[PDB]
Amino acid sequence: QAGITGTWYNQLGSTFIVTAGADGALTGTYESAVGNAESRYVLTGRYDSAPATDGSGTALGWTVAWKNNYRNAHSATTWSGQYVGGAEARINTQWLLTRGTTEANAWESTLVGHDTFTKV
Amino acid sequence: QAGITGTWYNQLGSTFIVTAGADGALTGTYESAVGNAESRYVLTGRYDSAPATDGSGTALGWTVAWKNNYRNAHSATTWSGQYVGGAEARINTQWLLTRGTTEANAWESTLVGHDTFTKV
Amino acid sequence: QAGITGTWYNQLGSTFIVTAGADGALTGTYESAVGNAESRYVLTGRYDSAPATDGSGTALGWTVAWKNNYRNAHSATTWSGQYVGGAEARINTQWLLTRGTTEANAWESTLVGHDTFTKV
Amino acid sequence: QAGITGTWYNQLGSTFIVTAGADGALTGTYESAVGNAESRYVLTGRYDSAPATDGSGTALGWTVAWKNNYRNAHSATTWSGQYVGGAEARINTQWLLTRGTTEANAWESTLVGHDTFTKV
């Protein structure tokens, strides 16, 4: 909970500001250093509030809808990954970015990638 | 908002109960008809509250952490897709399921699939 | 081998013409009914030539580089899925389409989707 | 073609031995440093033999069916990514691993990840 709460940065220089609730909630803001996006976007998600004690990571995910007071890309990213604690704590994610499309372009609606978040 | 709020079922017979907030919030419960899961799990997500008017779908996503009062799979799914309105309304998604793992099994942490939700 | 060899069509009306070799090879041509593509493109892949006998599908995959004598999209799709035999035989796939990009756009290089191939 | 042909290693210590044909063919062997696998497995794939000259990567992909003379995992991985030339040449991929399953487990058939291959 303390492990997760705070400010994370990924390999692109994006900024992930999250609070982890005792009830498994993730709340905060995301700022992308790339694409048609600016300023902060609301995020919400979930994480495993009672993780395995066997040295496994803590599963979590979250969503950003790329609508704020500045821009609307008509799109949503979800990140699915795990928090790894210790010396150099990481969130290792894979993400799906779905654009809103016509049924004609639905085949090309979704980008896939991977982001690694660190504290520094 | 009305379009999205309610009870959806996917091709597996899973049950997705969501409220769409005027502010872009998605809140509700998920019940999987498959895997090591039972009863309802909390979900949260986001959707584009001001979608394009050009016949495009409405981008959205959401997260479930597979922890409730019955089971803890130490895992999280995110669904990323779009709501398509009209006669037979659909949510078309792709999803990432991340297990918590040791760094040794991190390569095999994430399942990927696709779910289609309908109202019936 | 007989199961797989022949002409398949996906939900988009694309045409997948494949021969399965006794040695696990997949060879043929792909024709996309969508995107910046025309005519046939070479495909190669692999499949499990000795599948489980327990009613499981047969794992397989294949690649198309979107270069032929007509167009070069500077991109490659791989499909990963399984052949399901019987009355209505299917190839159920998920696919990754990677464009060639600058390191600046590498984050947006890859589309993800799902295709279902049938014989009809 | 020269750029691609040779021996690559990913972050797991797996060994990707490939020849790039003038006609866009990729042929070779894969050895996984992880999972239920041993020794070399046949791979085939495709790459863009006439890439953009604007500093973009070269799109490519390839398939391994996890059957050789030692083991049969009844599964196939496809890697989709791009070759980046220059000082520290890379193949940056995302991959889909499909197991053969019953229709009952088809939802959990596919793992997704990302591998980075370097020359050293």
Swiss-Prot record, chains A, B, C, D:
Keywords: Biotin, Secreted, Signal
Motif Cell attachment site per UniProt: ranges: 46-48
Chain positions recorded as biotin binding sites: Y30, Y41, W79, W95, W107
Domain annotation Avidin-like: ranges: 2-120
Subcellular location: Secreted
Domain of life of the source: Bacteria
A molecular-function term among this protein's GO annotations: biotin binding
Main location: secreted
A Gene Ontology term for the protein's cellular component: extracellular region
Coiled-coil portions: none
Quaternary data: Homotetramer.
Function text: The biological function of streptavidin is not known. Forms a strong non-covalent specific complex with biotin (one molecule of biotin per subunit of streptavidin).
Annotated family: Belongs to the avidin/streptavidin family.
Name of the protein in question: Streptavidin
Taxonomic lineage from the root: Bacteria, Bacillati, Actinomycetota, Actinomycetes, Kitasatosporales
